[PDB]
Amino acid sequence: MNLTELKNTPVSELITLGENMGLENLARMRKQDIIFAILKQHAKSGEDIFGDGVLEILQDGFGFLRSADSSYLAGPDDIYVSPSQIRRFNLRTGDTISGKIRPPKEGERYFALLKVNEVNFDKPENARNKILFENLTPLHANSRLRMERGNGSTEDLTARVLDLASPIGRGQRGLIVAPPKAGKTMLLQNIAQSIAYNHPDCVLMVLLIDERPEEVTEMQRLVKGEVVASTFDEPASRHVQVAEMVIEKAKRLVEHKKDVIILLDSITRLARAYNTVVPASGKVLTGGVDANALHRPKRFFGAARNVEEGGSLTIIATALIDTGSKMDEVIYEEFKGTGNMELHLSRKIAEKRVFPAIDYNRSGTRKEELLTTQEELQKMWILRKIIHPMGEIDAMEFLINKLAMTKTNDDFFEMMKRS
């Protein structure tokens, strides 16, 4: 029996099974407490039980096993992991561990695992011989990740304008600069929908920091891919924990020949959380930030690369500007030359309100020639020449209203070159 489906399913049928199984009081406790209750009841009754999740290592081998659907929240539902199997399997943090589990004994209140049957969707001995992510030589974004939905939906215009503005490739570092109230959240969720539609094979991941619970749950419901969203309720320590979990799990997954796409919003809040959580080293820059307190966000963002032999790690992040805090645009300025593609959502169109509100002229990406086909290069180049002179607002209206009757990108290109 798998507890992952127990946690995935809502609580109504869990409660009904609680009464139908003979549990005295299941009314008033947490979700993880309820899961622990039914798991303990199964252990007492003697039914065979399995376990799965993502593994994490403490400072002394006090290994834990959390779940993605629980947002890596610490609780009784987590699985204990002793150092014995860690040393005899050479496993590390962020390994997708599935196998047999053991009920807790006296003096210990966490479920343990008896024998692992699979690690990272692979056999344990086959997955034993793997190369570290930092030992893989990066290469260019050879494969183009087209964002075209293809159905001509009422929301496909955003995907089409994103494709024209800047193509998305494997192992690509992304900057999204935008003032507050500019439609970033829906841009990322539309990107997630397009990725799920066009490329179901790739593992889609989304990461959210201090987002409102309604936004968290709408993100969970809208996209089929799993999402990790640490709300503002918990302190910055849980933000650090979930961010490290996500990035290092993605590292392990790309070590297993699986290309990974992750969405983050926003990098500025994550950098601020790291600055607050870490102790100061005695040197403080403008805005209350430190180089030792901020190099770890740079390591996080720079982990994106394309593996030379197989798989990739692509990171797309959003930056906040004009928020009134000096460290915000300070860390924006330091991030001018850290990502290989950048896109701006200029605010002038935001109060013009015609959507999507992106600065097409300012947005751009390097290494177009090695990323997509040549005729596409000449076509976007002609588009850049015809869009450069006039202002950004009327350019946005021009672009959207000539993207209205056109069905696909080829339709737009042929109507452009036939006139």
Partner 1 sequence: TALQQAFDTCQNNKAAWLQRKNELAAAEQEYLRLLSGEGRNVSRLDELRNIIEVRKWQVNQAAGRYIRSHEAVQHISIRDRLNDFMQQHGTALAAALAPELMGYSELTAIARNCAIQRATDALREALLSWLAKGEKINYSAQDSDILTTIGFRPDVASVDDSREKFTPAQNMIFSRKSAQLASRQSV
Ligand X SMILES: Nc1ncnc2c1ncn2[C@@H]1O[C@H](COP(=O)(O)OP(=O)(O)OP(=O)(O)O)[C@@H](O)[C@H]1O
Q: Is the dihedral of CA 183, 188, 192, 197 positive or negative?
A: positive
**DSSP class of 134:** G
**Nearest by Cα to 63 from 41, 85, 45, 42:** 85
Regarding 185 and contact with Mg ion (CB under 5 A), the answer is yes
Identity of residue 398: F
Q: Which is nearer to partner 1, 268 or 409 (CB)?
A: 409
* Residue among 33, 155, 322, 394 that touches partner 1 (CB under 8 A): 155
- Quote the tokens at residue 154: 């009422």
Regarding 338 and contact with Mg ion (CB under 5 A), the answer is no
Which residues does 202 contact at the CB level (< 8 Å), separation at least 6? 145, 195, 258, 259, 260, 261
DSSP string, 394-407: HHHHHHHHTTTS--
Regarding 96 and contact with ligand X (CB under 6 A), the answer is no
User: Binding mask 176-205 vs ligand X (x if CB under 6 A, - otherwise)?
Assistant: --x-xxxxxxx-------------------
Binding span for Mg ion by CB under 5 A among 115-123, 151-159, 164-172, 177-185: 177-185
Q: Which is nearer to ligand X, 354 or 415 (CB)?
A: 354
Minimum CB separation from ligand X for residue 392, in Å?
A: 16
**Nearest by Cα to 273 from 304, 302, 242:** 242
Region of residue 406 (phi > 0: left; psi between -120 and 50: alpha; otherwise: beta): beta
# of chain residues touching partner 1 (CB under 8 A): 14
Regarding 351 and contact with a second copy (CB under 8 A), the answer is yes
Contact 260, 195 (CB under 8 A): no
- Count of alpha carbons within 13 Å of 132, Cβ hemisphere only? 7
Query: Within positions 259 to 318, which residues make up the interface with a second copy, using CB under 8 A?
Result: 269, 276-277, 279, 283, 285-286, 288, 291-292, 295, 298-299, 302, 305-306
Alpha carbon distance 381, 368 (integer Å): 10
Query: Within positions 368 to 387, which residues make up the interface with partner 1, using CB under 8 A?
Result: 369-375
Regarding 25 and contact with a second copy (CB under 8 A), the answer is yes
Alpha carbon distance 401, 399 (integer Å): 6
User: Binding mask 359-398 vs ligand X (x if CB under 6 A, - otherwise)?
Assistant: -------xx-x-----------------------------
- Quote the tokens at residue 411: 């339709």
User: Binding mask 135-174 vs Mg ion (x if CB under 5 A, - otherwise)?
Assistant: ----------------------------------------
Is residue 169 annotated as involved in ligand binding? yes
Q: What angle do CA 306, 312, 314 make, to 5 degrees?
A: 90
* Residue among 60, 125, 309, 351 that touches partner 1 (CB under 8 A): 309
Q: Which is nearer to ligand X, 83 or 180 (CB)?
A: 180
Beta bridge partners of 314: 261
**Nearest by Cα to 45 from 5, 103, 99, 109:** 103
Is residue 181 annotated as involved in ligand binding? yes
* Partner from a second copy, ligand X, partner 1, none binding residue 372, C-beta < 5-8 Å depending on class: partner 1
Is residue 150 annotated as involved in ligand binding? no
Residue numbers belonging to the annotated binding site: 169-174, 181-186, 212
Residues that bind partner 1 (CB under 8 A): 154-155, 157, 308-310, 355, 369-375
